[PDB]
């Protein structure tokens, strides 16, 4: 639910998806990539007041009942997507799928 | 990996698995579980000096304007087997994603 549809419409201070465009040559020094020239990688950022996994719900409950709280949550990636690229070995084209390059959704963990 | 084997007897300040024992009745208010009385839930915590996090770390050095800074969070989760009663009939259940097994900087 903390995806582009929800986040990229109203700039919110709390956790959720943030737009980020990365140029391979300029931003990463990956000069060998023929296609694409860059991509919408995005990132996750913002305050976590907001309980995806059973373990996250357990910790959240424990932190209120035990006098000594454990960890506090932070904004991180939930769903990721690969990115397909094109490079050349001499004149031979090579297509590669790079897993987990794009962040589609965020969560407080 | 950032797991019990690496982290537990090597207490350092960077991102690591940390021990946390939780008592069901005392800490959660879950009075229905018969066995076990508690379990090692653990958690992830510490400083952070996937391909997306590795590209973000590279972008943050090359671009003059850095984006997000990494978080210490749960990587792998494990189920916990419990025993409870529905009346006087025993019921074993595997409760999904109850334990954190390893951590990551993301």
């Amino acid at each position, epitope marked *: 639910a903390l995806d582009a549809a929800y986040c990229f419409r109203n700039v919110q201070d709390n956790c959720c998806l943030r737009p980020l465009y990365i140029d391979f040559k300029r931003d990463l020094g990956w000069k060998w990539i023929h296609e694409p020239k860059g991509y919408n990688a995005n990132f996750c950022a913002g305050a976590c007041p907001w309980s995806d996994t059973q373990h996250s719900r357990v910790l959240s409950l424990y932190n209120t*009942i035990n006098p*000594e709280a454990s960890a*506090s949550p932070c904004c991180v990636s939930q769903d990721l997507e690969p990115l397909t690229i094109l490079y050349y070995i001499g004149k031979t084209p090579k297509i590669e799928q790079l897993s987990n390059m794009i962040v589609k959704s965020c969560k407080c963990s | 990996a950032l797991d019990a084997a690496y982290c537990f007897r090597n*207490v350092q300040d960077n991102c690591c698995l940390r021990p946390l*024992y939780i008592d069901f009745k005392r800490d959660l208010g879950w009075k229905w579980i018969h066995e076990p009385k508690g379990y090692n839930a653990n958690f992830c915590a510490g400083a952070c000096p996937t391909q997306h996090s590795r590209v973000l770390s590279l972008y943050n050095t090359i671009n003059p304007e850095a984006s997000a800074s990494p978080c210490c969070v749960s990587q792998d989760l494990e189920p916990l087997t419990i025993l409870y009663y529905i009346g006087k009939t025993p019921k074993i259940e595997q409760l999904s994603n109850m334990i954190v097994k390893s951590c990551k900087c993301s």
Partner: antibody
Amino acid sequence: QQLQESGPGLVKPSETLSLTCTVTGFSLSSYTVNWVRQPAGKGLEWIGYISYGGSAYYASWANGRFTISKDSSKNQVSLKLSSVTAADTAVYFCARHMQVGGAPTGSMAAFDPWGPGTLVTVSS
Amino acid sequence: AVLTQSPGTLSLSPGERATLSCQSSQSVYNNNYLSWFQQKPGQPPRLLIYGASTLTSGVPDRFSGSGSGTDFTLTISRLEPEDFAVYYCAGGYSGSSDKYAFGGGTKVEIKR
């Protein structure tokens, strides 16, 4: 196992107070550190802590004025008090939870060791 | 969460039994999250008892604690001159804020 508070000693009214507690012989990733103040001729008052796991919790009377955080790379715990008043004149102590966090037996409301304390006078 | 300590002051001779009460407004976490401290002037408090009845390493045998839930008592069986101090109780609680709280203290003065 030692705790030592550092502070400016004298602070002007409405300014920001910044205290430091330097830790020796133990890891901040293992133990929770608390701030406790004691006004002249008054009892001890728990302000809050920065837990072994990184969670900050405060007394109700704090009203968002206090920020307790740590930097384990500098072996330091900090307290930040905004808009100080004469009511904030007190000896401020740094005090560790007696036991490591997350074990089946907690610290049972015990604090040990304590720092020697640093006096903060709020005055023009 | 409020801890009430009584009496506010007690003056007793070396050899006498000192009985200090600590009453919690709400149950302490696990019924035993209650500790006792001794504070001497210009010094940080010294932990004496933790978990209502467990004596800290090096603390004399004359100190003993009891109670569970809400009513706690600190006993100093055979008072010594070095036992003059202000004694505090501290409780542990569930909540979003007041995780810990100290009692108002009992001042122990030695009669001579």
